[PDB]
Each structure stands twice: as structure tokens, then as C-alpha cells.
Design a protein around this ligand. Structure first.
Ligand SMILES: Oc1cc2ccccc2cc1O
Length: 222
């Protein structure tokens, strides 16, 4: 398949990304608590449902939530201010809460079943969100870094296999603050560092210029 792109909702961020996040890729956004990673996830879950002329892929979404941070009412607001019907947008987001890291890993295998079901339809899965990818692994493997890296490596390999095999954009969030971080090392296809700037602006930089945007009723925008 050709590489598809999903607009982030921000012209600035899209330019930094060469058009948007890519299918057949894992995009990892990392930054401190409150930097806007989950807002970017919510916005992408709407943007992907637009036609290509508007930066989407007419796609369905699967969302794995590890922190109970998915907000349907926020999806509705973004959809309504992106010219879409909010009920339709929500009906094309499959949502699951991961209870722990082992359940999170099983959910990725379950996602493949729905990906296959929708593959030949007019609304194939085009976006798989894992928010937060690392939170359960970090809390469960305190004092056991070697084992944590083994399990994370398999989880990321599963996510890669889905991105490439089914032409999906995988978007993952990772909280990294004071003294923290192996990030995801070199595992993602693309690492985006997100931070707060003056006056509520958010600033994005590729790790391995900078885009600037705001969080608004449209999700994010310049
Ligand atoms: O209905 C489902 C929703 C999911 C969401 C994310 C990951 C896996 C899922 C599996 C489902 O059957």
C-alpha cells in the first residue's frame, strides 16, 4: 500500500510531519503530564474520518486507553467543529480500557480481529491509538527494568506488525518528565517531543524546526 497521512488538525504540525502522521508507522509522542498528548490523540481520532481532500483517510479508529482519559464528549466537540456528525464519528471509534499491561497486550491481538473484519469495507481501520502505551509497564515493573524492556519490545513489535501489515497509523503516547525516560528508545518509527510554551501554546519537535499550535474546540489548530 502507499503511505497514507492523517492530518493532525494543525497546519504547523502537519508541515513538521510532512503532511501528517503516516500509515505503516508508529508515531510516538512524548512529554510531561499536561503537554497535550491526549488532546492530539482525540483530534487524530476525528481527523482520520475526513476524506483525503481534508486530510483524513475515511478511516475507522481503534483506541486502547490505559488511564481512563478518553472523553467521548471531547470527540463530539472536535467532530462538531470539524464539520462531521459526532454520532457517526463516535460509532467509528472502537474503544477498550486496558486493565494492566498483560491485558493491554491481549487487546492488541484482539484489535487484529476487528482490523481484518473492516479491511475490505469503506471504513477500514486506519488509526490505532494506545494512550498511554507505557503507564502500566512502568508501574508494574518497578525495580525490574530488564523484564519491562522485554515485554515492551514484544508489545511494540506487535504494533509494528499491525501498522505495516494492515496499512494503519499507530499513534502512541508516553509520559516522560523529571529524571524519567528511556522514551521508547529507537522503537517508534517517529518520535515527537511535545511541550507547553508561553500562553498555553504547545510546541512540537522531531527527535532523531518546531511546530506551534493551540488546543481549541477544533482539537488542535495553528
Ligand atoms: O470491540 C473492540 C474494541 C477494541 C478497541 C481497542 C482494541 C481492541 C478492541 C477489541 C474489540 O473487540
Amino acid at each position: 500500500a502507499t503511505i497514507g497521512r492523517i492530518s493532525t488538525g494543525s497546519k504547523s504540525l502537519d508541515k513538521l510531519l510532512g503532511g501528517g502522521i503516516e500509515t505503516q508507522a508508529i508515531t510516538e509522542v512524548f512529554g510531561e503530564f499536561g503537554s497535550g498528548k491526549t488532546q492530539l490523540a482525540h483530534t487524530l481520532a476525528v481527523m482520520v474520518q475526513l476524506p483525503p481532500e481534508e486530510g483524513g483517510l475515511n478511516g475507522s479508529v481503534m483506541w486502547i486507553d490505559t488511564e481512563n482519559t478518553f472523553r467521548p464528549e471531547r470527540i463530539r466537540e472536535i467532530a462538531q467543529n470539524r464539520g462531521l456528525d459526532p454520532d457517526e464519528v463516535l460509532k467509528h471509534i472502537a474503544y477498550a480500557r486496558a486493565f494492566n499491561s498483560n491485558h493491554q497486550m491481549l487487546l492488541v491481538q484482539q484489535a487484529e480481529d476487528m482490523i481484518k473484519e473492516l479491511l475490505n469495507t469503506d471504513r477500514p481501520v486506519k488509526l490505532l491509538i494506545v494512550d498511554s502505551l507505557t503507564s502500566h509497564f512502568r508501574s508494574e515493573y518497578i525495580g525490574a527494568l530488564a523484564e519491562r524492556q522485554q515485554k515492551l519490545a514484544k508489545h511494540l513489535a506487535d504494533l509494528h506488525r499491525l501498522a505495516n501489515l494492515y496499512d494503519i497509523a499507530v499513534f502512541v503516547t508516553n509520559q516522560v518528565q523529571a529524571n524519567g525516560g528511556h522514551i521508547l528508545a529507537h522503537s517508534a518509527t517517529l518520535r515527537v517531543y511535545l511541550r507547553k510554551g508561553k500562553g498555553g501554546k504547545r510546541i512540537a519537535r522531531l527527535i532523531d524546526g518546531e511546530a506551534v499550535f493551540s488546543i481549541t474546540e477544533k482539537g488542535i489548530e495553528d
